[PDB]
């Protein structure tokens, strides 16, 4: 159950250079005696918050930075505090990708963007526009080939087209990503997904194509182009394909806008090996030799470490990666990114299969992306459970005393005064309060992490309110005052 002291367990995705990373772990063990176990479990980014919530999981978790705000909201990550001399060794924008509510919550490793990858023997002059792909596919179909195959099961790969003409995830305004301003169903997003769906309708792509299908077709010379990231180049090198890496096609005259990911390494808040983890990441991995060992296994892309990036930048494939990154933008790291991705995944699959029109698929995704996160819903349920336990006490107290108040100016002391990061009190001053009614109110101790209050009456009718000035630190035994932006709990 508990993480073992005196060892490092690392999780990293199966498309990355995990054998190269294990070589870094071997060097760490030679120098320190500390064994390093690198694992690449399936769905590691979903497993981590499940097991880390209980104090389990790896010491170190690797993923793109977009997952990390959610992990931090759940209290799963240790704060990262590099010395200034170390911080200056990495590009500032990579630290900003892993900065959440003022704190660094991971070490940045590498900067990833998708590029267009093309077979130079089939296609010495690849297209500059998406619009010319249908004609090109027709020519290649006459030769027993196809123009383009890429993973249609993951929204990461289709997003650059959706974003090109105006799609966006969350608008950045007034100094934050605004989770109420989602750009998934505007005209530009609809234009881009419509074009992808048109390609499928016209048999230029097949809706069922996934990562392995598209990789095999490209690496076997059956399709002229694919869309993928630097991690994919290793398997192409093994193949007989002479490939180039270039800027993504434009759509309606505008660049495709890939979402740029920073592969990042966080430290589990429950790890008893935090100082060893920091030494591994700072002094072994984030060095020219450490990144090289990973890069030799599967290319990292551009790296966050300035010294090594100066070498990698001379590789034309890295120059092309950077060109596409410059036309995209950094993913937000905020907790809501999970809801955004799951929503767009379903939309693309549904529109591409014909199960829904583009308009209906994206209208649903727009709603789902802005809807209450899984964290918020779980928190509300868990806080409500604590309210129910206190309500049970209130009814026990009532039977014992004939009223809900202890005295005319004092409420009885509750059995569950804190739960799930909320303080819980009776709501309303006791003076003049009626004898056969009560209200319980739960307020967050950390109101940036849990920006809502929950209140419940004696018959368990519950409201969630997003605006309240109440504070758990005000030194009082009750709450008073009105809440705003309230909605019935169902
Ligand atoms: O689609 C469901 C999927 O949504 C979320 O996954 C997203 C990743 O969080 C995001 O980083 C990006 O993933 C790509 C990696 O950055 C890249 O290094 C490489 O591994 O390819 C990945 C894409 O397959 O985009 C995906 C969305 O496609 C969410 O975190 C997942 O739990 C969920 O399964
Ligand atoms: O939406 C479902 C997807 O999200 C999660 C996992 O990473 C994927 O294996 C899964 O297909
Ligand atoms: Na340091
Ligand atoms: Na910090
Ligand atoms: Na923000
Ligand atoms: Na690289
Ligand atoms: Na470039």
Residue numbers in the entry: 1 to 490
Which sentences did the original study use to describe this structure?
To facilitate purification and crystallization, we used a synthetic comP gene, codon-optimized for expression in Escherichia coli, and fused the 115-aa-long soluble portion of ComP to an MBP modified to promote crystallization by surface entropy reduction (Moon et al., 2010). This soluble portion of ComP excludes the 6-aa-long leader peptide, which is processed by the dedicated prepilin peptidase PilD (Brown et al., 2010), and the first 28 residues of the mature protein, most of which correspond to the hydrophobic residues that form the protruding part (α1N) of N-terminal α1 helix in type IV pilins. After optimizing the best diffracting crystals, we collected a complete dataset on crystals formed in the spacegroup P212121, which diffracted to a resolution of 1.43 Å, and solved the structure of the fusion protein. As can be seen in Figure 3, the ComP moiety adopts the classical type IV pilin fold (Giltner et al., 2012) with the C-terminal part of the long α1 helix (α1C) packed against a β sheet of four antiparallel β strands. Subtle differences in ComP's conserved core include the lack of curvature in α1C (as previously observed for PilX) and the rather long loop (14 residues) connecting β1 and β2, the first two β strands of the β sheet. While ComP's α1β1 loop is an extended unstructured region, its D region is particularly striking. Unlike in (most) other type IV pilins, where one disulfide bond stabilizes the C terminus of the protein by stapling it to β4, in ComP the C terminus forms a long unstructured loop held in place across the face of the β sheet by two disulfide bonds between the four Cys residues in the protein (C76-C125 and C118-C139). The C118-C139 bond delimits the loop by stapling its C terminus back to β4 and is therefore equivalent to the single disulfide bond found in other pilins. In contrast, C76-C125 is unique and pins the middle of the loop back to β1. Finally, three of the last five residues of the protein form a short β strand (β5), which is incorporated into the β sheet.
